[PDB]
Design an enzyme around this catalytic site. Structure first.
Site, PDB file in Angstrom:
ATOM      1  N   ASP A   1       0.802  -1.223   0.000  1.00 18.55           N
ATOM      2  CA  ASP A   1       0.000   0.000   0.000  1.00 18.55           C
ATOM      3  C   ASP A   1       0.837   1.276   0.000  1.00 18.55           C
ATOM      4  O   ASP A   1       1.272   1.783   0.999  1.00 18.55           O
ATOM      5  CB  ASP A   1      -0.908  -0.018   1.225  1.00 18.55           C
ATOM      6  N   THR A   2       1.011   1.819  -1.229  1.00 18.01           N
ATOM      7  CA  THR A   2       1.790   3.041  -1.342  1.00 18.01           C
ATOM      8  C   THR A   2       1.117   4.268  -0.741  1.00 18.01           C
ATOM      9  O   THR A   2       1.791   5.271  -0.479  1.00 18.01           O
ATOM     10  CB  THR A   2       2.135   3.348  -2.832  1.00 18.01           C
ATOM     11  N   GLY A   3      -0.166   4.138  -0.441  1.00 18.08           N
ATOM     12  CA  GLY A   3      -0.936   5.163   0.235  1.00 18.08           C
ATOM     13  C   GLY A   3      -0.955   5.029   1.726  1.00 18.08           C
ATOM     14  O   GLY A   3      -1.711   5.775   2.363  1.00 18.08           O
TER      15      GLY A   3
END
EC number: 3.4.23.16
Lengths: 99, 10, 99
Positions: free
Chosen positions: A25-27
């Site tokens: 999850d880059t967020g």
């Protein structure tokens, strides 16, 4: 590897002697795992996202193996609906977004 | 402090 | 480009003729934007995240630019804490995770 995004980027991790599935999850600033035991001291934390906040336990200096790549960092444990690998450990395995 | 954007469809 | 994850992967988007900042989020199925006006009819959606759920408006076939890359697709509008570009549009711009 190169992971496409047609489906959720789910991988296998090893943490605390246990195998789990987790979302890359880059967020996410942080790595958040469902309830499990981890060694060492911890402290409480509030983290937020799309639907408000949840309370977690913060453990530091935790080793994880993410799709075969080892990393160490802070791991938050609490009532997350999905295990998430966040940027604090994505950096350590050399993960980038490319387009 | 919000910084974990996991998002899931219904 | 190649975007590393030591900082949040924030980019400039264009929607409705206006520039906005948004987060490239491999952990999001969908694209969710803070309250704004979009044309046409909408449909309801309940989306979930780390803290529970929020209700959003689904708009289809919306013209949007993401870091200069043109996409046309579904945009959700509602009380998201941050603008999120999810996999429905990351795939349109050819984004992959690499390590």
């Amino acid at each position: 590897p190169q992971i496409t995004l047609w489906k959720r980027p789910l991988v296998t991790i090893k943490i605390g002697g246990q195998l789990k599935e987790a979302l890359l999850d880059t967020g996410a600033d942080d790595t958040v795992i469902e309830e499990m035991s981890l060694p060492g001291r911890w402290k409480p934390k509030m983290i937020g996202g799309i639907g408000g906040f949840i309370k977690v336990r913060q453990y530091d200096q935790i080793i994880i193996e993410i799709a075969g790549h080892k990393a160490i960092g802070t791991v938050l444990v609490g009532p997350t609906p999905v295990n998430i690998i966040g940027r604090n450990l994505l950096t350590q395995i050399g993960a980038t977004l490319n387009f | 402090r919000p910084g974990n954007x996991l998002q899931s469809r219904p």
